Amino acid sequence: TACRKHELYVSFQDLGWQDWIIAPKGYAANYCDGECSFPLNAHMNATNHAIVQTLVHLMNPEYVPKPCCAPTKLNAISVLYFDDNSNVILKKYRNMVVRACGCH
Amino acid sequence: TACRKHELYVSFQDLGWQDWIIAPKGYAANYCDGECSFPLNAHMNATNHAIVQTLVHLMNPEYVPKPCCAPTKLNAISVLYFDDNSNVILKKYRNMVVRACGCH
Amino acid sequence: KLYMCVCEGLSCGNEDHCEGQQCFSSLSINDGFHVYQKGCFQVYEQGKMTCKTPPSPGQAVECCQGDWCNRNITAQLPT
Amino acid sequence: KLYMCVCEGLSCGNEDHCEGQQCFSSLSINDGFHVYQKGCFQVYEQGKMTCKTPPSPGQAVECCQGDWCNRNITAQLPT
Amino acid sequence: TRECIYYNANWELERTNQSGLERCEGEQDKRLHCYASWRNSSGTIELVKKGCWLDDFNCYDRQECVATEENPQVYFCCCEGNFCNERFTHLPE
Amino acid sequence: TRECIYYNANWELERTNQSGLERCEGEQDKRLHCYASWRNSSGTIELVKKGCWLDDFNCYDRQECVATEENPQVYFCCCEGNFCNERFTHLPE
Ligand SMILES: *[C@@H]1O[C@H](CO)[C@@H](O[C@@H]2O[C@H](CO)[C@@H](O[C@@H]3O[C@H](CO)[C@@H](O)[C@H](O)[C@@H]3O)[C@H](O)[C@H]2NC(C)=O)[C@H](O)[C@H]1NC(C)=O
Ligand SMILES: *[C@@H]1O[C@H](CO)[C@@H](O[C@@H]2O[C@H](CO)[C@@H](O[C@@H]3O[C@H](CO)[C@@H](O)[C@H](O)[C@@H]3O)[C@H](O)[C@H]2NC(C)=O)[C@H](O)[C@H]1NC(C)=O
Ligand SMILES: *[C@@H]1O[C@H](CO)[C@@H](O[C@@H]2O[C@H](CO)[C@@H](O[C@@H]3O[C@H](CO)[C@@H](O)[C@H](O)[C@@H]3O)[C@H](O)[C@H]2NC(C)=O)[C@H](O)[C@H]1NC(C)=O
Ligand SMILES: *[C@@H]1O[C@H](CO)[C@@H](O[C@@H]2O[C@H](CO)[C@@H](O[C@@H]3O[C@H](CO)[C@@H](O)[C@H](O)[C@@H]3O)[C@H](O)[C@H]2NC(C)=O)[C@H](O)[C@H]1NC(C)=O
Ligand SMILES: *[C@@H]1O[C@H](CO)[C@@H](O)[C@H](O)[C@H]1NC(C)=O
Ligand SMILES: *[C@@H]1O[C@H](CO)[C@@H](O)[C@H](O)[C@H]1NC(C)=O
């Protein structure tokens, strides 16, 4: 019931990316979950619009839904994968992991 | 049932900011709503993490919730308000309106 | 490059014309229904990762690289 | 400036110490309960806008500017 | 681009410019406007704040600057135009 | 800061450097590593890709470079250290 950074380990064996990804076999996505209620403390990194929205939701519940707990700080991970021509390529996929979840 | 930019007009008379804000009497927040399901088209401006999350949600529904429809492009609005010393000050409040909602 | 394909489905900006690097057609099982989607991918990294997944129960992301390649390549679930 | 105040409540990073420009204490009516919150605001614009609203049914954001100003300024709903 | 006359009543305390004309600034695809705010004071007009204003829906295509608000503590009129904040009237809507 | 030996097998088609040592790059509070990937080929070892690798949980405190994966199409070992991608062994876990 609060915007948090729940940690989890996602494996590429389960997603089906098993015969075209050499490494990593899995990484940590650290999804975000919770709810945002008026007012929001500095811990919940929120924008001004998020605050206006939660206030207009407190004034009228059916008018506007609560803000959404979304990632704010993301990093990148390196993936060494096969292409369609049996070659292998290293690429830095951006915005793959989460390090902070705010009421964006 | 899709990440959209629903338009609305929020007035400062209803939020209680009536006797310390001179202008504007109200503006347009344009909140965001919807749901994100695998896969996501280029219209739903989503990050790589959002795609990984919706995929791990499709594989297992109770493991991870769906991504959240959050604003991506925001603008700023000028507010001319009274301070605590009966003076009047103009300030550019940033991130007050929404112009695009993606599966952030 | 760029390729114009149809954009039928629940989510599109009211323009069937979709200009993308990789067009596709998907058929899921989300919310216990058979929702059909057809669209384009203007992001190579995302298009590749979402077009390399192995078709299974729940997903049917059949992609395509050519001109109007999406019209008649309707997705179909597996066994 | 910066001011250290308590951070009791449902949402905090497990650190009562909260360093902020404006500390406060709130008592809402969200989800039909009387949830209490106490925290700090490291954003002047947001702290001001949220501390200038007029107390009413549903909200009770009583703020404070000083040192440990939040401990004994518990919020109370209006009439 | 646009430009409005910037007169700030608090020039002393904020050590800012008192008089002058200031260029407006804004992002791409964002209209800019001029804003004037003054106190009537039962006839003794006293200019307060005048300058640039960001995109506003209710301030649209205002070739003149008219304060439509009736009996306000601080009269405020927003206009769209080059140097449109030099003339202002209080016409109740 | 860190640095790993960068040898890329595709130097021709991508018109990139074939041999050399390349400095690693990363953000603040982000460990960097070295990665090596090769094909055993029933004894005829053929180096493929070697270089810098971003933060990885399973590649942690690897003073050496060991490919723990059993019978892979492309052997891959990640190590944490300065120039740790010059020696590699296939030790099945
Ligand atoms: C809002 O954004 C801030 C700033 O990014 C987030 O604060 C960060 O919170 C994390 C999790 O508590 C901190 O990581 C922890 O730091 C120490 C030192 O290592 C230790 O307790 C843990 O091992 C962990 O690494 C991080 O330092 C902190 N960052 C800053 C700059 O203070 C905050 O979490 C965000 N809000 C939410 C609701 O996620
Ligand atoms: C994902 O981001 C893109 C890029 O910001 C968003 O596309 C934008 O969509 C809006 C709404 O359809 C477009 O505004 C419209 O443009 C024309 C010309 O004025 C007209 O149809 C309407 O009057 C309206 O202003 C906007 O031009 C368009 N931007 C770009 C660069 O194409 C998109 O909406 C975002 N996705 C979602 C789900 O919101
Ligand atoms: C400051 O406040 C004064 C007082 O309210 C304003 O003067 C008022 O201006 C209006 C303009 O519509 C006058 O109404 C018109 O006046 C004459 C007859 O007197 C006629 O043209 C119309 O029938 C209409 O009634 C109003 O009489 C006048 N009031 C007084 C006491 O003189 C003034 O405009 C305000 N100035 C600013 C800069 O805000
Ligand atoms: C490439 O593949 C070959 C063949 O699998 C690898 O050689 C193998 O290396 C292991 C190392 O543990 C040898 O196991 C050990 O061998 C001796 C007895 O033969 C003894 O030290 C231990 O009892 C253990 O069994 C294995 O025999 C050997 N296989 C062959 C056919 O020679 C080689 O290491 C791989 N090289 C790379 C760079 O990946
Ligand atoms: C503001 O004051 C400075 C310093 O005297 C002057 O150079 C500048 O032209 C002034 N700008 C305006 C808009 O009056
Ligand atoms: C890459 O090649 C360039 C051009 O010859 C050379 O200057 C540079 O030192 C090389 N870098 C490495 C790491 O080998």
DSSP C9-74: BSSSSS-S-EEESEEEEEE--GGGS--EEEEEE--HHHHHHHHSS--BTTB--EEE-STTTTTT--
Q: Is F53 in the pocket of ligand 4 (CB under 6 A)?
A: no
Parallel, antiparallel, or unpaired: how do β-strands C62-64 and C22-27 relate?
antiparallel
First to last CA, chain D: 34
**Residues near F16 by Cβ (< 8 Å), separated by ≥ 6?**
F8, F10
What radius of gyration do chain E's Cα atoms show? Answer: 13
Confirm or reject contact between B8 and chain A (CB < 8 A).
Answer: yes
How would you write chain B as a 3-class SS string?
A: CCCEECCCEEECCCCCCCCCEEECCEEECCCEECCCCCCCCCCCCCCHHHHHHHHHHHHCCCCCCCCCCEEEEEEEEEEEEECCCCCEEEEEEEEEEEEEEECC
Token look-up 């793959």 returns: A96
Q: How far is residue C40's CA from residue B41's CA, in Å, rounded to a whole number?
A: 6
Residue of A30, A31, A43 with the most ligand 1 atoms within 8 Å of its CB, for mutation: A43
DSSP D6-74: ---BSSSSS-S-EEESEEEEEE--GGGS--EEEEEE--HHHHHHHHSS--BTTB--EEE-STTTTTT--
Q: Which residues of B touch E30 (CB under 8 A)?
A: 75
CB C63 within 8 A of CB C73: no
Q: How far is residue A35's CA from residue F92's CA, in Å, rounded to a whole number?
A: 45
Rounded to the nearest whole angstrom, what is the distance from the C-alpha of residue F18 to the centroid of ligand 6?
Answer: 9
Rounded to the nearest whole angstrom, what is the distance from the C-alpha of residue A80 to the centroid of ligand 3?
Answer: 77
Rounded to the nearest whole angstrom, what is the distance from the C-alpha of residue E15 to the centroid of ligand 5?
Answer: 12
Per-residue CA distances from E88 to B87, E58, F37 (Å): 22, 17, 74
Distance of CA A24 to the CA centre of its chain: 19
Closest-CA residue to A41 (of D55, D10, D34)? D10
Closest-CA residue to A65 (of B101, F73, B32, B25)? B32
Distance of CA B95 to the CA centre of its chain: 8
Q: Which residues of B touch D56 (CB under 8 A)?
A: 16
Distance of CA A98 to the CA centre of its chain: 5
- Residue nearest ligand 1's atom 34 by CA: A100
Which DSSP category does F66 fall into? B
Question: Which residues 5-64 in chain D show a CB within 8 A of chain A?
Answer: 7, 9-13, 18, 20, 24, 26, 28, 30, 35, 37, 39-43, 45-46, 49-50, 53, 58-59, 61
Tokens of B102: 């993606």
**Residue C44 backbone phi and psi in degrees, to 5:** -60, -50
Per-residue CA distances from C38 to B43, B66, D8, F70 (Å): 12, 20, 49, 40
**Residues near E59 by Cβ (< 8 Å), separated by ≥ 6?**
E33, E35, E53, E78, E79, E80
* Per-residue burial over D28-41, b = 16 or more CB atoms within 10 Å of its CB, e = otherwise: bebeeeeeebbbbb
Confirm or reject contact between A99 and chain B (CB < 8 A).
Answer: no
Closest-CA residue to A39 (of B23, D3, D43)? D43
Tokens of A4: 């948090």
**Cross-strand partners of F84:** none
Half-sphere exposure of F25 (CA within 13 A, CB side): 3
Rounded to the nearest whole angstrom, what is the distance from the C-alpha of residue F17 to the centroid of ligand 6?
Answer: 6
Closest-CA residue to B34 (of C10, D77, A24)? C10
Domains and CATH numbers, chain C: 3-64 (2.10.60.10)
| C37 CB neighbour count, 10 Å cutoff | 24
Rounded to the nearest whole angstrom, what is the distance from the C-alpha of residue F66 to the centroid of ligand 6?
Answer: 28
> Could you list the residue range(s) of the whole structural domain that residue F70 is in?
1-93
Closest-CA residue to C61 (of C72, C76, C46)? C76
Q: How far is residue B68's CA from residue F44's CA, in Å, rounded to a whole number?
A: 50
Q: How far is residue F24's CA from residue F1's CA, in Å, rounded to a whole number?
A: 7
**Cross-strand partners of A45:** none
Q: Give the residue from chain C lying closest to B66, CA to CA.
A: C30
Which DSSP category does E84 fall into? -
Confirm or reject contact between C4 and chain B (CB < 8 A).
Answer: no
Confirm or reject contact between E10 and chain B (CB < 8 A).
Answer: yes
Q: Does domain B4-36+67-102 have CATH number 2.40.110.10?
A: no
Closest-CA residue to A79 (of E77, C21, D79, C46)? C46
CB D11 within 8 A of CB A41: yes
Q: How far is residue C31's CA from residue C35's CA, in Å, rounded to a whole number?
A: 9
Q: Does domain A4-102 have CATH number 2.10.90.10?
A: yes
Q: How far is residue C63's CA from residue C65's CA, in Å, rounded to a whole number?
A: 7
CB contact (8 A) between residue B27 and residue E57 = yes
Which DSSP category does F54 fall into? -
- Number of independent structural domains in chain E: 1
DSSP chain A: ---EE---EEETTTTTTTSSEEE-SEEE---EE----SS--TTS---HHHHHHHHHHHH-TTTSPPP--EEEEEEEEEEEEE-TTS-EEEEEEEEEEEEEEE--
Picking from A16, A91, A94, the nearest residue to C53 by CB comes out as A16
Q: Give the residue from chain A lying closest to B28, CA to CA.
A: A49
Token look-up 């497990």 returns: D14
| A and C in touch (3+ CB pairs within 8 angstroms) | yes
**Residue B42 backbone phi and psi in degrees, to 5:** -60, -20
CB B50 within 8 A of CB B40: yes
Coil, helix or strand at residue E1:
coil
CB F67 within 8 A of CB F79: no
> CB burial class (10 A; 0-12, 13-18, 19+) of residue C44?
exposed
